[PDB]
Ligand SMILES: *Cc1c(COP(=O)(O)O)cnc(C)c1O
């Protein structure tokens with residue numbers, strides 16, 4: 001049965017993990033996968049989280065099945081984070097959320113949902129973008145088309161190119177938007193641009209699909225949801241896949257959600273029934289632990305206070321690191337100007353390096369980054385900043 | 397987009413959960429989903445588990461991504477449980493295990509794996525069987541065929557019928573076997589029958605696929621794996637999906653595994669690469685919590701000792717309950733003889749009731765069971781045994 005099977009191609013991002021574990025050199029600087037590191041170069045578990053886990057260990061009495069869509073309180077809390085405490089979608093019961101195994105799991109159940117219950121044949125994704133989007137949608141049978149987005153030689157959102165390419169999108173097809181902290185460019189549209197996109201979308205008949213994996217890492221919780229809420233205010237239907245992996249540092253606990261929005265509750269319920277079917281035929285119900293932690297925190301005023309401050313400190317350390325990065329580079333005498341880095345939202349640095357420069361970086365200097373020239377700034381720390389910059393200056 | 401979508405059909409088993417939550421009557425006896433209940437009618441979290449969670453809360457320092465196949469130690473431990481501490485499959489490195497979100501998640505990744513990388517067009521499942529098997533395999537695109545298994549008017553394994561129907565299975569197609577505690581008949585083949593099936597299988601060219609969700613609930617850990625090891629000893633390739641939901645009572649933490657076995661390590665590795673691809677396009681990596689708990693317990697002598705005893709007490713309470721069930725029935729004057737119940741392995745009672753009798757049970761008496769006439773004996777307790785039996789005697 002398995003004699004003819006061929007080796008699968010390695011993942012451009014997740015594959016870095018395996019490359020790293022095979023390298024014996026001690027001074028390896030890992031700036032690949034987008035995980036947050038503190039000043040000591042460790043990706044720690046939040047205090048609010050530890051406190052919640054303490055509470056769960058003491059108050060949890062059963063481990064019984066969670067119900068297809070997961071913890072109800074968890075879903076309600078996520079809707080408020082996404083649409084605002086007094087949103088119309090929430091009041092008119094137009095939204096239904098399913099707890100899922102991470103944001104990726106959400107993209108998968110959405111894709112399966114779309115493929116079997118809708119006439120969507122193709123999904124539109126940006127370029128530059130996130131590799132996993134194409135894999136996920138192609139595996140569900142949907143065709144993936146790319147739209148223009150980044151202005152390389154200027155380092156800004158090529159808004160005219162964005163609309164010109166999107167003119168190709170027909171009514172009925174899906175358009176994938178990054179909520180905030182665009183992976184990998186870090187450049188997001190402004191509120192006015194979001195509004196333009198929203199009106200153009202409603203008018204053109206596209207089914208919007210938001211991938212929200214970095215809420216709170218750009219400006220803040222509420223501000224980062226601005227674009228989404230703009231679309232939510234004009235749209236009748238939409239899908240939003242969110243993740244709590246990064247803003248709660250619950251990476252391996254696979255905590256995410258998939259929210260469906262329809263014209264009314266009758267439609268959303270009828271639709272959600274089919275999304276539950278897609279889920280039940282996959283993993284049945286979702287892992288409780290991570291979601292319980294989030295609900296506990298999000299539901300306790302004291303805990304939420306600690307958590308938001310921790311989120312603030314993470315965003316602040318990254319902002320400090322990129323400003324320090326640019327500085328140490330000029331300090332080391334980099335021939336190219338990387339000041340544009342400071343305008344990027346999120347955890348990454350994108351735009352300066354080529355496929356070969358990053359290859360040389362890992363080979364000669366043991367610095368690991370993605371082949372697209374994307375570096376995880378959150379992996380940068382005061383102690384690795386100098387060696388890291390010396391490596392980069394030698395490769396420019 | 398979502399106007400034409402139709403309401404999905406409810407799940408025959410998981411749907412019971414929703415039926416129950418809508419019934420306001422106080423004396424509802426839930427004997428539907430196969431979850432263990434103690435004397436007090438609660439499905440509690442094991443002490444060994446609580447101890448492990450305590451240890452994790454204190455020793456866990458990061459929540460960083462788990463790697464596609466999950467916790468290595470967890471996989472190794474599961475291989476020993478399944479194939480025995482000194483198995484050849486383990487020594488010759490012929491087996492590769494991936495941590496998955498429950499046993500259902502394992503069946504799904506196996507189905508996706510098969511559909512895209514193999515020429516398997518159909519999977520053979522028993523009748524009576526577990527409804528989810530058909531859903532899972534059909535959603536991956538594979539066709540599901542059923543084979544004879546149970547002798548209703550005798551309450552035994554119809555072994556001749558089993559082989560006669562399986563003669564229809566061609567070389568290349570999958571045959572699904574329940575490791576032990578056959579859901580729902582509770583009747584498993586004997587070691588000699590397992591051996592016959594093993595030889596017939598190798599000779600006929602079927603790819604065996606074991607669903608191991610109740611190890612330890614029939615006779616014991618080692619004894620329950622006898623059939624599997626018989627096949628493992630004669631087979632070159634095989635797949636085994638196991639669950640820790642029941643034997644560890646970690647239901648909502650989604651703890652399972654998918655193990656692939658090939659002729660040698662070269663083949664199994666090449667094959668596993670594609671299974672990792674199927675996983676990465678689904679949920680990326682699995683939830684850490686539940687698997688960590690199992691690895692902690694399974695890896696600590698003291699903890700394992702406590703855990704095995706708890707598993708023993710669960711099996712013993714269920715055995716006591718079915719003997720008490722049969723007795724109270726005759727005590728109440730049931731016209732039909734249900735003594736065959738005592739020969740059933742696992743958590744269920746199957747064979748006495750009809751679709752209408754169970755319907756009347758939930759309607760008139762508020763007793764919930766699956767429409768197939770399958771009752772969760774583990775849900776039976778000294779306090780609900782009497783009312784439960786009175787309901788049944790009134791419906792016979
Ligand atoms: C991280 C990320 C996700 C989701 O990650 P999960 O670990 O699966 O929660 C989705 N989209 C983008 C762009 C991401 O960066």
Ligand SMILES: *Cc1c(COP(=O)(O)O)cnc(C)c1O
Nearest residue numbers: 498499500526579607609639641
């Ligand atoms: C319980 C069960 C499974 C797996 O359950 P999970 O909660 O998904 O681990 C698989 N097969 C059968 C027959 C079962 O009873």
